[PDB]
Design an enzyme around this catalytic site. Structure first.
Site, PDB file in Angstrom:
ATOM      1  N   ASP A 127      -3.069   9.451   4.381  1.00  0.00           N
ATOM      2  CA  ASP A 127      -3.386   8.868   2.706  1.00  0.00           C
ATOM      3  C   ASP A 127      -4.861   8.330   3.262  1.00  0.00           C
ATOM      4  OD1 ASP A 127      -3.682   7.653   0.749  1.00  0.00           O
ATOM      5  OD2 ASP A 127      -2.078   6.886   0.303  1.00  0.00           O
ATOM      6  N   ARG A 131      -8.930   2.500  -0.545  1.00  0.00           N
ATOM      7  CA  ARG A 131      -7.859   0.895  -0.579  1.00  0.00           C
ATOM      8  C   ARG A 131      -6.952   0.759   0.736  1.00  0.00           C
ATOM      9  NH1 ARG A 131      -6.700   5.121  -3.169  1.00  0.00           N
ATOM     10  NH2 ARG A 131      -5.904   6.238  -2.391  1.00  0.00           N
ATOM     11  N   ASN A 132      -7.092   1.891   1.473  1.00  0.00           N
ATOM     12  CA  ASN A 132      -6.000   1.378   3.088  1.00  0.00           C
ATOM     13  C   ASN A 132      -7.518   1.187   4.079  1.00  0.00           C
ATOM     14  OD1 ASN A 132      -4.103   2.111   1.626  1.00  0.00           O
ATOM     15  ND2 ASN A 132      -4.401   4.506   1.901  1.00  0.00           N
ATOM     16  N   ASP A 145      -2.720   1.322   7.605  1.00  0.00           N
ATOM     17  CA  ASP A 145      -1.341   1.829   7.552  1.00  0.00           C
ATOM     18  C   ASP A 145      -1.314   3.120   7.500  1.00  0.00           C
ATOM     19  OD1 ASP A 145      -0.387  -0.813   6.631  1.00  0.00           O
ATOM     20  OD2 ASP A 145      -2.058  -0.334   5.612  1.00  0.00           O
TER      21      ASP A 145
HETATM   22  C1  LIG Z   1      -9.947 -14.956  -2.165  1.00  0.00           C
HETATM   23  N1  LIG Z   1      -9.869 -14.065  -0.346  1.00  0.00           N
HETATM   24  C2  LIG Z   1      -8.752 -14.300  -0.292  1.00  0.00           C
HETATM   25  C3  LIG Z   1      -7.976 -13.831   0.945  1.00  0.00           C
HETATM   26  C4  LIG Z   1      -8.198 -12.282   0.363  1.00  0.00           C
HETATM   27  C5  LIG Z   1      -7.668 -11.641   1.739  1.00  0.00           C
HETATM   28  C6  LIG Z   1      -7.253 -10.140   1.492  1.00  0.00           C
HETATM   29  C7  LIG Z   1      -6.063  -9.785   2.176  1.00  0.00           C
HETATM   30  C8  LIG Z   1      -6.454  -9.680   3.997  1.00  0.00           C
HETATM   31  N2  LIG Z   1      -6.450  -8.964   5.359  1.00  0.00           N
HETATM   32  C9  LIG Z   1      -4.951  -7.999   5.197  1.00  0.00           C
HETATM   33  C10 LIG Z   1      -4.133  -8.028   4.175  1.00  0.00           C
HETATM   34  C11 LIG Z   1      -3.583  -6.678   4.720  1.00  0.00           C
HETATM   35  C12 LIG Z   1      -2.466  -5.637   3.302  1.00  0.00           C
HETATM   36  C13 LIG Z   1      -1.811  -7.061   2.010  1.00  0.00           C
HETATM   37  C14 LIG Z   1      -1.140  -6.066   0.935  1.00  0.00           C
HETATM   38  N3  LIG Z   1      -1.129  -5.484   1.346  1.00  0.00           N
HETATM   39  C15 LIG Z   1      -1.643  -4.240   2.545  1.00  0.00           C
HETATM   40  N4  LIG Z   1      -1.092  -3.078   2.250  1.00  0.00           N
HETATM   41  N5  LIG Z   1      -1.461  -2.306   1.563  1.00  0.00           N
HETATM   42  C16 LIG Z   1      -1.516  -0.993   1.223  1.00  0.00           C
HETATM   43  C17 LIG Z   1      -0.857  -0.014   2.437  1.00  0.00           C
HETATM   44  C18 LIG Z   1       0.004   1.481   1.690  1.00  0.00           C
HETATM   45  C19 LIG Z   1       0.764   2.076   3.126  1.00  0.00           C
HETATM   46  C20 LIG Z   1       1.368   3.279   2.849  1.00  0.00           C
HETATM   47  C21 LIG Z   1       2.061   3.718   2.984  1.00  0.00           C
HETATM   48  C22 LIG Z   1      -0.364   3.828   3.188  1.00  0.00           C
HETATM   49  C23 LIG Z   1       0.592   3.481   1.153  1.00  0.00           C
HETATM   50  C24 LIG Z   1       1.517   0.852   3.375  1.00  0.00           C
HETATM   51  C25 LIG Z   1       1.195  -0.073   3.163  1.00  0.00           C
HETATM   52  F1  LIG Z   1       2.163  -1.440   4.330  1.00  0.00           F
HETATM   53  C26 LIG Z   1       0.192  -1.032   2.909  1.00  0.00           C
HETATM   54  C27 LIG Z   1      -0.342  -2.398   3.051  1.00  0.00           C
HETATM   55  O1  LIG Z   1       0.930  -3.199   3.619  1.00  0.00           O
HETATM   56  C28 LIG Z   1      -2.427  -4.886   3.901  1.00  0.00           C
HETATM   57  C29 LIG Z   1      -2.519  -3.422   4.349  1.00  0.00           C
HETATM   58  O2  LIG Z   1      -1.843  -4.086   5.519  1.00  0.00           O
HETATM   59  N6  LIG Z   1      -3.590  -6.414   5.616  1.00  0.00           N
HETATM   60  N7  LIG Z   1      -3.826  -6.934   7.105  1.00  0.00           N
HETATM   61  C30 LIG Z   1      -3.420  -6.454   8.166  1.00  0.00           C
HETATM   62  C31 LIG Z   1      -4.784  -7.911   6.638  1.00  0.00           C
HETATM   63  O3  LIG Z   1      -5.495  -7.897   7.289  1.00  0.00           O
HETATM   64  N8  LIG Z   1      -7.578 -10.617   4.124  1.00  0.00           N
HETATM   65  C32 LIG Z   1      -8.153 -11.461   3.020  1.00  0.00           C
HETATM   66  C33 LIG Z   1      -9.358 -12.029   0.615  1.00  0.00           C
HETATM   67  C34 LIG Z   1     -10.264 -12.205  -0.636  1.00  0.00           C
END
Ligand SMILES: CN1CCC(c2ccc(Nc3cc(-c4ccnc(-n5ncc6cc(C(C)(C)C)cc(F)c6c5=O)c4CO)nn(C)c3=O)nc2)CC1
Length: 264
Positions: A127, A131-132, A145
């Site tokens: 994938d 977005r990933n 991911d």
């Molecule tokens: C104003 N600001 C406020 C903070 C904001 C912000 C947002 C974020 C930030 N960091 C991180 C944020 C994230 C994070 C947060 C939310 N969702 C996901 N996410 N998305 C897609 C996804 C897809 C899959 C498949 C099986 C492939 C379909 C499987 C998954 F498990 C996921 C999954 O978990 C992730 C990515 O790990 N991670 N990591 C390491 C980060 O470091 N850091 C800052 C940026 C904007």
């Protein structure tokens, strides 16, 4: 490989992913981590637990490093590298950044370096989309991911007809035969390169998910993005050859991106 859950400290909510709640924390009160809190019945826990061994042996600087797991609890936790600037797609859409084409070319190199690492480890992402992909404090772009799509229990994501399926990042043999290969990840890279030079624009933007699969078969490929050179578009186009065997490898594509910046 197991991480102590009490060794973690919840500090901020990083949003929602496929497996629910994601948070920002600290391991042993000094090292920054991201904690994916696996939602009940969203993951094939058994299969994920066993495969996390191979995923941890994968250590490339442009890959989001999986630090470990908390498997002796419900919900189970995944501890990964923390990327301060978050999602690459969201980062590309923020107009404030006012990116140079040299920056967009550098972003492609960061994804390509990681992907050639995964290719040399005979590992598929399955994938590959913006977005990933994630962005750290240094503006370094990292592949996230990878391979976790195998453990997604969700019906709308697993099915090629489903609303969550990565239709636009998928080649014709995937959409039609479910023929996943190195070349299916190779097609996705050309789409990711397009997302970068299109500044987070949705591929086949005018079309509906259903209408996208029809045009992809007919031979309709993504146009030259406004910010893309003729030489840069030749690279993203080479990923979309109808015959998968004619598409190049991440090794070749890496050489391609590096020759283009020396001639930028
Ligand atoms: C104003 N600001 C406020 C903070 C904001 C912000 C947002 C974020 C930030 N960091 C991180 C944020 C994230 C994070 C947060 C939310 N969702 C996901 N996410 N998305 C897609 C996804 C897809 C899959 C498949 C099986 C492939 C379909 C499987 C998954 F498990 C996921 C999954 O978990 C992730 C990515 O790990 N991670 N990591 C390491 C980060 O470091 N850091 C800052 C940026 C904007």
């Amino acid at each position: 490989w197991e991480i102590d859950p009490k060794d973690l400290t919840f500090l901020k909510e990083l949003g929602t992913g496929q497996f629910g709640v994601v948070k920002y924390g600290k391991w042993r009160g000094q090292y920054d981590v991201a904690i994916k809190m696996i939602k009940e019945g969203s993951m094939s826990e058994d299969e994920f637990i066993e495969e996390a061994k191979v995923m941890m042996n994968l250590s490339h600087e442009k890959l989001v490093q999986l630090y470990g797991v908390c498997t002796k609890q419900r919900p189970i936790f995944i501890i990964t590298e923390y990327m301060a600037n978050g999602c690459l797609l969201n980062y590309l859409r923020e107009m404030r950044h006012r990116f140079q084409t040299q920056q967009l070319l550098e972003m492609c190199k960061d994804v390509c370096e990681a992907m050639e690492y995964l290719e040399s480890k005979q590992f598929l992402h399955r994938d590959l989309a913006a977005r990933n992909c994630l962005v750290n404090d240094q503006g370094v772009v990292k592949v996230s991911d990878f391979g976790l799509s195998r453990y997604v229990l969700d019906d709308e994501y697993t099915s090629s007809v489903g609303s969550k399926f990565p239709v636009r990042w998928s080649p014709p043999e995937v959409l039609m035969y479910s023929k996943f290969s190195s070349k299916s990840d190779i097609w996705a890279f050309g789409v990711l390169m397009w997302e970068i030079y299109s500044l987070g624009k949705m591929p086949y933007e005018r079309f509906t998910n259903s209408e996208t699969a029809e045009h992809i078969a007919q031979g309709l490929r993504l146009y030259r993005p406004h910010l893309a050179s003729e030489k840069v578009y030749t690279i993203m186009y080479s990923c979309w050859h109808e015959k998968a065997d004619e598409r190049p490898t991440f090794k070749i594509l890496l050489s391609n991106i590096l020759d283009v910046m020396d001639e930028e």
